[PDB]
């Protein structure tokens, strides 16, 4: 899931919804899970390390 688009899709299928955008930063909220999750969207591959951190924030 290193592609930013595939990653955003995985978050969305988990119920995370886009609420705000700041340049390339995409801010996501969930109706049941806690926290705001910011995902960078370059439409390119992100490093595995930053991907894992995003998954952890999203409760995945």
């Amino acid at each position: 899931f290193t592609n930013s688009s595939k990653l955003i899709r995985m978050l969305e299928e988990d119920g995370w919804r886009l609420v705000r955008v700041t340049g390339s930063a995409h801010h996501f909220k969930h109706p049941k899970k806690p926290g705001l999750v910011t995902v960078p969207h370059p439409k390119k591959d992100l490093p595995i390390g930053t991907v894992k951190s995003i998954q952890k924030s999203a409760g995945l």
């Binding site: 290193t2 930013s4 609420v19 705000r20 700041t22 340049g23 390339s24 930063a25 801010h27 909220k29 926290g35 705001l36 999750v37 910011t38 995902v39 960078p40 370059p42 390119k44 591959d45 992100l46 490093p47 595995i48 390390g49 930053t50 991907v51 894992k52 951190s53 995003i54 952890k56 924030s57």
Partner: protein
């Protein structure tokens, strides 16, 4: 309280990716390291502005590189430091009335006169410092 370590990851075919461990959920990226650092500050500002607008809690710690560097999730990462005053990110702050002892107020007023600060800005920053010390 205003300086945040950022963890920079980079794979063979990837861009530079950034984590801000002290503000949970903040992530960023860049084609270059200079871009990644610049983007990360904008992502912090945007993330916290979003929280403020939604009336969500803004929770954040203040760590040094040293206390973060050995955590397994940051293995192989490189570090930088981003300066953001989170207390200036509310566009609709609340106006309130408070009783401040005269001697305290005189010290505040004398301190902010020489600097590029206001009473309100000084107090908000000082309040966050004190709340971080109450958490430590």
């Amino acid at each position: 309280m205003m300086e945040f370590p950022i963890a920079v990851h980079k794979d063979d075919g990837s861009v530079y990716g950034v984590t801000v461990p002290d503000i949970p959920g903040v992530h960023s990226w860049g084609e270059t390291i200079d871009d990644a650092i610049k983007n990360t500050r904008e992502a912090i500002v945007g993330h916290v502005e979003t929280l403020i607008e939604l009336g969500e809690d803004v929770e954040f710690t203040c760590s040094t590189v040293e206390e973060l560097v050995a955590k397994p999730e940051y293995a192989g990462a490189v570090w930088a430091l981003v300066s953001v005053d989170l207390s200036q990110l509310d566009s609709k702050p609340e106006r309130i009335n408070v009783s401040i002892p005269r001697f305290v107020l005189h010290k505040i007023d004398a301190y902010v006169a020489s600097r590029h600060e206001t009473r309100s800005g000084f107090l908000a920053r000082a309040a966050l410092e004190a709340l971080n010390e109450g958490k430590k």
